[PDB]
């Protein structure tokens, strides 16, 4: 996260962190959607141009964390993975269309004040919250000096035409973009290590937080005038449900 502020304790209790087992390194963000299921970006697990193709046993997740470096006794939980499911139509060669993966925990995580699931959006929530100018929230431990505690930014969704002209890549309806214009109304942004993490929005109608997007590809905290892209969670909701029901 670049140009964020310090998150508060328990502000983002669905925040999950993806680690490489060996050597230990933070790979990505992720989110908790039930006691056993973790949503993340496919490019966090499978990216062949960088020789990245993790199995379950290469990875672990840590949940309920706040401080990047301090061990949080009786607060934070660690979990191993039973199974990884990457969207079969994930397009890593071109545009990272369908950049989505699910991870099943070996064992259920107990919810607490620090660990709690975010909602998947329903149609009505997608239809009314996903509008150009409406703001969402990204949280993470991406490099921008590196965060001591979890960082938060809030970013406006960008108009599709402005997204399209911002990049040479062929964008799709399965993704949306967010960020402040090269003008200025702030200059916050998700970064490389925030990838996989949730883009959440709070519903005024019912007071619940919904995960509307998954932070997609970033390199550094520099997008060179561009906007970050987000996998459109509601459009991929049937797929998420299909994986969960069968497995």
């Amino acid at each position: 996260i670049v140009e964020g502020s310090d998150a508060e304790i328990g502000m983002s209790p669905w925040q999950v962190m993806l680690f490489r087992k060996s050597p230990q390194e933070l790979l990505c963000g992720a989110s908790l959607i039930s006691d056993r299921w973790v949503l993340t970006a496919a490019h966090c697990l499978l990216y062949p141009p960088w020789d990245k193709n993790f199995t379950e046993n290469d990875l672990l997740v840590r949940i309920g964390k706040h401080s990047r470096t301090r061990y949080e006794r009786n607060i934070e939980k660690i979990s191993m993975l039973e199974k990884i499911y990457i969207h079969p139509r994930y397009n890593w060669r071109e545009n990272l269309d369908r950049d989505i993966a699910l991870m099943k925990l070996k064992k259920p995580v107990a919810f607490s004040d620090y660990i709690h699931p975010v909602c998947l959006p329903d149609r009505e929530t997608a239809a009314s919250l996903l509008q150009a100018g409406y703001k969402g929230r990204v949280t993470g431990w991406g490099p921008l000096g590196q965060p001591s505690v979890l960082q938060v930014v809030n970013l406006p969704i960008v108009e599709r035409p402005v997204c399209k002209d911002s990049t040479r890549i062929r964008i799709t309806d399965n993704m949306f973009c967010a960020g402040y214009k090269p003008d200025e109304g702030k200059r916050g942004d998700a970064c490389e290590g925030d990838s996989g993490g949730p883009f959440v929005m709070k519903s005024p109608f019912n007071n619940r937080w919904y995960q509307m997007g998954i932070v997609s590809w970033g390199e550094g905290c520099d997008r060179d005038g561009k906007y970050g892209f987000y996998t459109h969670v509601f459009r991929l909701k049937k797929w998420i449900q299909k994986v969960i029901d069968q497995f």
């Binding site: 699931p117 909602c119 929230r137 809030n154 406006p156």
Partner: peptide, 29 residues
């Protein structure tokens, strides 16, 4: 995972507001 989803034990469950959530709700024009 869906009954209590999206309601934070330290925020909504306590009638507590975080520091920047107003910025999001104010944005919904």
């Amino acid at each position: 995972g869906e009954a209590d989803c999206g309601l934070r034990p330290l925020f909504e469950k306590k009638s507590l507001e975080d520091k920047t959530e107003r910025e999001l709700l104010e944005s919904y024009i």
